[PDB]
Design a protein around this ligand. Structure first.
Ligand code: K
Ligand code: K
Ligand code: K
Ligand code: K
Ligand code: K
Ligand code: K
Ligand code: K
Ligand code: K
Ligand code: K
Ligand code: K
Ligand code: MG
Ligand code: MG
Ligand code: MG
Ligand code: MG
Ligand code: MG
Ligand code: MG
Ligand code: MG
Ligand code: MG
Ligand code: MG
Ligand code: MG
Ligand code: MG
Ligand code: MG
Ligand code: MG
Ligand code: MG
Ligand code: MG
Ligand code: MG
Ligand code: MG
Ligand code: MG
Ligand code: MG
Ligand code: MG
Ligand code: MG
Ligand code: MG
Ligand code: MG
Ligand code: MG
Ligand code: MG
Ligand code: MG
Ligand code: MG
Ligand code: MG
Ligand code: MG
Ligand code: MG
Ligand code: MG
Ligand code: MG
Ligand code: MG
Ligand code: MG
Ligand code: MG
Ligand code: MG
Ligand code: MG
Ligand code: MG
Ligand code: MG
Ligand code: MG
Lengths: 100, 153, 68, 384
RNA sequence: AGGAGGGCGCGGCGGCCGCUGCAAAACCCGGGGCGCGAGCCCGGGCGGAGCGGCCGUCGGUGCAGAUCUUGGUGGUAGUAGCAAAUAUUCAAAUGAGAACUUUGAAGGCCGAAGAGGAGAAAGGUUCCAUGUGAACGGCACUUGCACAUGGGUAAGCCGAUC
RNA sequence: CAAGGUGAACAGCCUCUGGCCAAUGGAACAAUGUAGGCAAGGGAAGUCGGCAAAACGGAUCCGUAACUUCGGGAAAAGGAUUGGCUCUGAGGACCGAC
RNA sequence: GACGGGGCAUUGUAAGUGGCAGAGUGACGAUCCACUGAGAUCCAGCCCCGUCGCAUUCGU
């Protein structure tokens, strides 16, 4: 089915104890793993702006939490993962949300 | 061409062959042993699973220093198994050749099984490696010949 | 569709480094058919090949520290 | 030639081989000797290691410098909710040793204990004991049950109860599969034992029916695993000099030229930890009974209302809501590990055995940091 | 240790007697025999053109060794190993096939007595374009300092030359 | 040939131009290694031997022994200070820099 | 299960706004004070519970 949701991924606990030269590369892999389990699609496409956001503090300081939007679409389905808009007051009280 | 085994039902059988294939002989011998009397459709799915790391190939001889996995625990209680991708892809190609040879003969793809599979050593190819104190040592590949006969029964 | 010849030619034509040449990612085929310095020039005038600006190295801090 | 200086050997040869235990639940290797004059009673119990804390008490011990003075002592908390009896097993003597005579099971077995008989409970039809339960419905089936019990009374020399824990009471264990063990009855006659164990079918036996306060017990369990380990940590040998080529964390000489073999007595690298251990003479300081004042961590000297659980829960365990034992000192294994508690095999006629413990204070500060409050109420009143 | 006799086998030459495309030599065989033995004779197969036995005589004439010579092949073994020079990621394109090719974006390194830009020795086409069977580029490649086909070095003032 | 900052400085560290991410990749963190750290209390008891490591370190002010070929020894030894900010004074040319 | 909330814990009072606080200088100005035991992080192997998901074999 075609559906779009907004998730908060806790990257801090997924990357705990990771090697410095692999923390940003592993965050990208954890994002792919998250989408495969959340929507069930083996094909996960990471948006370029989401790639920039993960890398915006270098290879070392990945953001602890990232609000992402995952849109599952028909090709055979694939997930498109993009950076979601953060409301004011941060991520406090924010669960998984359905878009449209 | 004469294979090492006659079909014993030549009208109801198809064959495929490959000489001097650049793939390790020891890896391919174990792969060929794992599907000895297998049905053609189960053999294809097994080899795709090996390519996808979902089913291991049991290494019985030529097994010294091979890890243990638990994917091979059935039909090999000690965990000695591996996933030789090149040896699996090369056999898969031969299985597709024999399958199309059977379709030309009109034999049904269903109820087809491997009645004969054989891996023989091809002539080795030479490369070179360099050692300490100005010494040269051989660096050799071990290609193989593969023979394959599918039979209805 | 390798463009390694076009990037080398554009670098020479625009008088910059290869790291300052920008080839339009949406015009990969149009740039590809070019094989002469004259064609590269026509692509520069059209706007498919651009010399990227210098990386910014500001002297603000040195000026501020010198006044201090 | 002889060695230049003497020192005792590193490690004990009495715990060999230092391998992984073949079981997870600790096993009683010897029950206490049966005294047929005493009333029928159980000799063992199963529990789960919650965590450690420290207590303060005033010591009554003449001749000691600690006499009439307070001491601080570390204690382990073992959560021990009641066991359910689900069967009986009889043993007869034989020139080859004891042999199981027969067993009788109860009509109702919970699914927690029935999970113990399956590798994959949710993929199965869950047929275990479904046809055995039909003997309790007909009249020929009930005749067999009574005949088996009468055979127990006539031929058995050892009678043991089959009991399981209520593992779902401890939610933090995250386990639905109960632990099952055989416990010996150590009183009365064989007919007394059979009658006593049969009346307990599908019934809960609390920890107070087995142990009492200020009693020395033995704790059986599997220690914490540590994986492959070198000789320095596994056996406690000394390191070599810093100058040592090819590393310094080895045994230098692993044997003489003759015998031309390595001996079983030389320290080698291998598995460290996860071993079966039987530790004895652990004193019970407290029996916390659910639904009673003894469950709280308040003493006669400290009337503060608090629970046994430290602030923020027992780290890696959770909250203790069932019955528990406070035991002096350390205990085998990590947190959540199932531990077997056994009555002492020897007579405890000693001052430490016969001492009466009176607690003055129980610490309930958080163990997840440098905790400084005893309750959440105190922490909130401090910050406003 | 050593000596001697009588025999078995290999290759020629002089003689004698034969065989073979209705299948010679060589080679293979849980085939059958003879001889104490060295050896010999036959059978079945392969192979496709030469070979044998007896008398005499002659010789580069018989192998298990020589850290023997040359060639081939094992176990070791799918093992030891592929770890210096901070580092990659995303999207797209191409292609049978992309961790490694190309484009864009991002994150990093060399840090100007450089991992930049040019020369003298030395090399000799490695330079550029197009194309790609295999080999090679100690993983891979659609890719190249590989391979194939073409193209390319202009002086009165720069040098040699004096 | 050879830029900006810090700094005495072509030291080390960071950056611009230009050039590069080529050094087989993926999964996991056992023993033993290799390279690099920390460690209470003691302080060479270790060892043939302080091997290795640690401590010292720039600049400013004070102060500096025996011995001496009178040149040195000498940075002997031994002490004190050092950030940021807001100012103040002095030192010039025909408005300026340290 | 994924978030989230609370508990527990570590560090030590966030950004921003305001102040007739502030050596002095001709608006600047280290710093200080209030909101503010604040802010940030907290299982990755911590504790307790409003939003969203969910093929291969074996017969004694
Ligand atoms: K192995
Ligand atoms: K000795
Ligand atoms: K110890
Ligand atoms: K030592
Ligand atoms: K002759
Ligand atoms: K000239
Ligand atoms: K290690
Ligand atoms: K010493
Ligand atoms: K603030
Ligand atoms: K405050
Ligand atoms: Mg190995
Ligand atoms: Mg080498
Ligand atoms: Mg050399
Ligand atoms: Mg002695
Ligand atoms: Mg025993
Ligand atoms: Mg040495
Ligand atoms: Mg703690
Ligand atoms: Mg044979
Ligand atoms: Mg002859
Ligand atoms: Mg001759
Ligand atoms: Mg000779
Ligand atoms: Mg020989
Ligand atoms: Mg010999
Ligand atoms: Mg030899
Ligand atoms: Mg040789
Ligand atoms: Mg060899
Ligand atoms: Mg290896
Ligand atoms: Mg190496
Ligand atoms: Mg690479
Ligand atoms: Mg550097
Ligand atoms: Mg740098
Ligand atoms: Mg050049
Ligand atoms: Mg070239
Ligand atoms: Mg290669
Ligand atoms: Mg060439
Ligand atoms: Mg000239
Ligand atoms: Mg210079
Ligand atoms: Mg300066
Ligand atoms: Mg410098
Ligand atoms: Mg290398
Ligand atoms: Mg690796
Ligand atoms: Mg110390
Ligand atoms: Mg001292
Ligand atoms: Mg000494
Ligand atoms: Mg000594
Ligand atoms: Mg000495
Ligand atoms: Mg030294
Ligand atoms: Mg001196
Ligand atoms: Mg929480
Ligand atoms: Mg967990």
């Amino acid at each position: 089915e075609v559906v779009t949701r907004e998730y908060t991924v806790n990257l801090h606990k997924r990357l705990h104890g990771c090697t410095f030269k692999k923390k940003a590369p592993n965050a990208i892999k954890e994002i792919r793993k998250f989408a495969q389990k959340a929507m069930g699609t083996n094909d996960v496409r990471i948006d370029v702006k989401l790639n920039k956001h993960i890398w915006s503090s270098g290879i070392r300081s990945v953001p602890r939490r990232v609000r992402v939007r995952i849109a599952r679409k028909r090709n055979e389905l694939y997930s498109l993962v993009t950076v979601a808009e953060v409301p004011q007051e941060g991520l406090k009280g924010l669960g998984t949300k359905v878009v449209e | 061409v004469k294979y090492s085994t006659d079909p014993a039902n030549p009208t109801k059988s198809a064959k495929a062959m490959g000489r001097d294939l650049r793939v390790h002989f020891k890896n391919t011998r174990e792969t060929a042993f794992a599907l000895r009397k297998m049905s053609l459709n189960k053999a294809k799915r097994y080899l795709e699973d090996v390519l996808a790391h979902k089913q291991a190939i049991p290494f019985r001889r030529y097994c010294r220093g091979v890890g243990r996995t638990a994917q091979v625990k059935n039909r090999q209680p000690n965990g000695q198994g591996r996933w030789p991708a090149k040896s699996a892809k090369f056999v898969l190609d031969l299985l597709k050749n024999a399958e199309s040879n059977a379709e030309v003969k009109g034999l049904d793809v269903d109820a087809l099984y491997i009645s004969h599979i054989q891996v023989n050593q091809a002539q080795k190819q030479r490369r070179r490696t360099y050692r300490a104190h100005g010494r040269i040592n051989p660096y050799m590949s071990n290609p193989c010949h593969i023979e394959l006969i599918l039979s209805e029964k | 569709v390798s463009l390694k010849l076009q990037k080398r030619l554009a670098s020479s034509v625009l008088k910059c480094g290869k790291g300052k040449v920008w080839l339009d990612p949406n015009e990969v085929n149009e740039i590809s058919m070019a094989n002469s310095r004259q064609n590269i020039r026509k692509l520069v005038k059209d706007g498919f090949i651009i010399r990227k600006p210098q990386k910014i190295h500001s002297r603000s801090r040195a000026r501020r520290a010198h006044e201090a | 030639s002889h060695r230049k200086f003497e020192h005792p050997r590193h490690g004990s040869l009495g715990f060999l081989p230092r391998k992984r235990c073949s079981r997870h639940r600790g096993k009683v290797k010897s029950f206490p000797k049966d005294d047929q004059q005493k009333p029928c009673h159980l000799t063992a119990f199963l529990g789960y290691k919650a965590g450690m804390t420290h207590i303060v008490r005033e010591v009554e011990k003449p001749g000691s410098k600690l006499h009439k003075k307070e001491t601080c002592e570390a204690v382990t908390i073992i959560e021990t909710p009641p066991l359910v009896i689900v069967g009986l097993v009889a043993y007869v003597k034989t020139p080859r040793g004891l042999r199981t005579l027969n067993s009788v099971w109860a009509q109702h077995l919970s699914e927690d204990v029935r999970r113990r008989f399956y590798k994959n409970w949710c993929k199965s039809k869950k047929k275990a004991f479904t046809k055995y339960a039909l003997k309790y419905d007909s009249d020929a089936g009930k005749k067999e049950i009574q005949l088996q019990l009468e055979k127990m009374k006539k031929y058995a020399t050892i009678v043991r109860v089959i009991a399981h824990t209520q593992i779902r009471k401890m939610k933090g264990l995250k386990q639905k599969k109960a632990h099952l063990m055989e416990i010996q009855v150590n009183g009365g006659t064989i007919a007394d034992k059979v009658d006593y164990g049969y009346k307990f079918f599908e019934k809960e036996v609390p920890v107070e029916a087995v142990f009492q306060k200020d009693e020395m017990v033995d704790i059986i369990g599997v220690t914490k695993g540590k994986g492959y380990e070198g000789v320095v940590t596994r056996w406690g040998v000394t390191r070599l000099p810093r100058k040592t080529h090819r590393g310094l964390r080895k045994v230098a000489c692993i044997g003489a030229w003759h015998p031309a073999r390595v001996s079983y007595t030389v320290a080698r690298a291998g598995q460290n930890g996860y071993h079966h251990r039987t530790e004895m003479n652990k004193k019970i300081y407290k029996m916390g009974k659910s639904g009673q004042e003894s469950h709280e961590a308040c003493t006669e000297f400290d009337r503060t209302e608090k629970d046994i659980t430290p602030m923020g829960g027992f780290p890696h365990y959770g909250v203790v809501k069932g019955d528990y034992l406070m035991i002096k000192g350390c205990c085998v294994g990590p947190k959540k590990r199932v531990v077997t508690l056994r009555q002492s095999l020897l007579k405890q006629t000693s001052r430490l055995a016969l001492e009466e413990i009176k607690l003055k204070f129980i610490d309930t500060s958080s163990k997840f940091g440098h905790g400084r409050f005893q309750t959440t109420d105190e922490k909130q009143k401090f910050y406003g």
